[PDB]
Ligand binder design. Structure first.
Ligand SMILES: [Cl-]
Ligand SMILES: [Cl-]
Lengths: 310, 313
């Protein structure tokens, strides 16, 4: 029981790398489902999806991340569990094969409470790396996902290698809380359990805290129209980005109340996505492209559909 | 002209060591009015203040900051311009006397333009140092909110982070919308608002408190808004429902034109105390205070809040 929606390559359309993203999206979804069926939690699932997404030599995450000004590699990643509302994130991490794994570890450790001080929800540089190792994590000698288990718990994660030639020590939206992803269950204030993951120009997603912002909007009755409004009002026309010459970014979203509504939206020419139900078998991949004539970073594309989980 | 409100951290009340805080708060405010009247950006006013704070060996920021799990100093700090809406942050930065300066610098370079490439607003550790260095920045929580005569606002925050924290651990002082916030009145927000936080970093980050306070202050009665936020969106916030005791403090200011500039400024905290300091332009006098939780009121369970009103121009 469960559902998964992932993304990769939310940027500019290439009549080439298309077939790859589809392939990595196909398995990323499956690994996730494998876990959901096998019984794992929303977080273990999403993590596995991102482990697969990062491992694709074609994604700018984990192995294959772009290189900073000094040719060195630095990864950003974060994850959030909707049931407990905990968050794990790493920034400018190097030497680890799966940065998301370190964020997930930080999250899990963080759920053990002060078992003997308040746990760290975000580490960076050498520190993140040392903590990772100090916890038995594979040391090497933008992609994201959303999930909902049989119980109804949503979760999300995101992983990226950052901008190319970015100055050393530059952290983007995949490490920043409320920006890269957001996972939050139902509550006396939230009618729906929502999960979000972002991609694109990290600076545009941060200045606007898009993830959190999408989750709050998606509390409205019309999911499709809530997201649309967010991508336009709070993103494309956001006062906080008025000094920009184009607003680039994309997001995937999941909303379960067990009814599951899933959507994706971008202001980039394209974004590849894949999804699959656990009571569905065989994944589904799609390349989302902006309407003809619509200018990249000036308009919005958005699609999605419902999916009942029995 | 202009106004200023600062703080030297929210936490335990230290009698005797209490006079050291009120003292640095004063010098901090002054440096602000000074640079302010000199006709400098609201950005320089807050930095000017933060530096003064960062230099007091009694404040967990800059010089005298808590040592990490390895006996070393790693600082976080950020700054936000309410006019341009830019932001500058550094996290886990060692080797620089004034982190806020690097935060400020990063902001400016941003305002300038596009290297093509979008400027970087958030840098951590190693590169954060190298950068601060290639920008002539002297090598070796506190907050401040300001409003210039034109009605613009700016917020800054600087912290040494949790004591004995595991290396590379970043807190609120470095995270957008968490440690500080600044936003001029706009088509939507009627009020120019500025916020700076302090306290248990994890608690402030998960509640994105700084930005939350700016949204809340958009309601009619600021005092009521600020209080309900500290209670319902902080102490009783669903995201901290597991934390037994929420510790944090915030100082904020709200302006608007009526020709005068009506300014409401407050300070609130769930910690035992918080030393703040406010002073107006032609005020010529700096007032300090050590906010304290109501006698017999549990810390991390209760909320203390105060605030006055200032009129400029
Ligand atoms: Cl990618
Ligand atoms: Cl602090």
């Amino acid at each position: 029981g469960g559902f998964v929606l992932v993304h990769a390559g939310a940027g500019y359309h290439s009549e080439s790398k298309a077939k790859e993203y589809k392939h990595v999206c196909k398995r990323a979804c499956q690994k996730a489902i494998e876990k959901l069926q096998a019984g794992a939690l929303a977080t273990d699932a999403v993590t596995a999806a991102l482990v697969e997404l990062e491992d694709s030599p074609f994604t700018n995450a984990g192995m294959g991340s772009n290189l900073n000004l000094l040719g060195e590699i630095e990864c950003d990643a974060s994850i959030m569990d909707g049931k407990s509302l905990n968050f794990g994130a790493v920034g400018a991490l190097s030497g680890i094969k799966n940065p998301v794994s370190v964020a997930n570890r930080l999250l899990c450790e963080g759920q053990k409470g002060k078992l003997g001080r308040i746990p760290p929800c975000f580490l960076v540089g050498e520190g993140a790396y040392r903590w990772a190792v100090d916890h038995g994590i594979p040391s090497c000698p933008s992609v994201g996902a959303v999930v909902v288990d049989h119980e109804g718990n949503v979760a999300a994660a995101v992983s990226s290698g950052g901008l190319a030639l970015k100055h050393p020590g530059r952290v983007g939206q995949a490490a920043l809380y409320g920006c890269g992803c957001w996972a939050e269950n139902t509550g006396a204030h939230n009618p729906y359990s929502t999960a979000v993951s972002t991609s694109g120009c990290g600076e545009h997603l941060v200045r606007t805290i898009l993830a959190r912002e999408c989750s709050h909007a998606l509390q409205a009755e019309d999911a499709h129209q809530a997201l649309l409004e967010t991508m336009q009002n709070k993103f494309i026309s956001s006062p906080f980005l008025a000094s920009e010459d184009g607003v680039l970014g994309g997001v995937i979203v999941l909303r379960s109340c067990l009814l599951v509504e899933f959507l994706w939206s971008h202001t980039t020419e394209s974004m590849c996505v894949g999804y699959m139900s656990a009571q569905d078998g065989k994944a589904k991949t799609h390349i989302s492209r902006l309407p003809p004539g619509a200018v990249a970073g000036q308009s919005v594309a958005i699609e999605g559909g419902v999916c009942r989980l029995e």
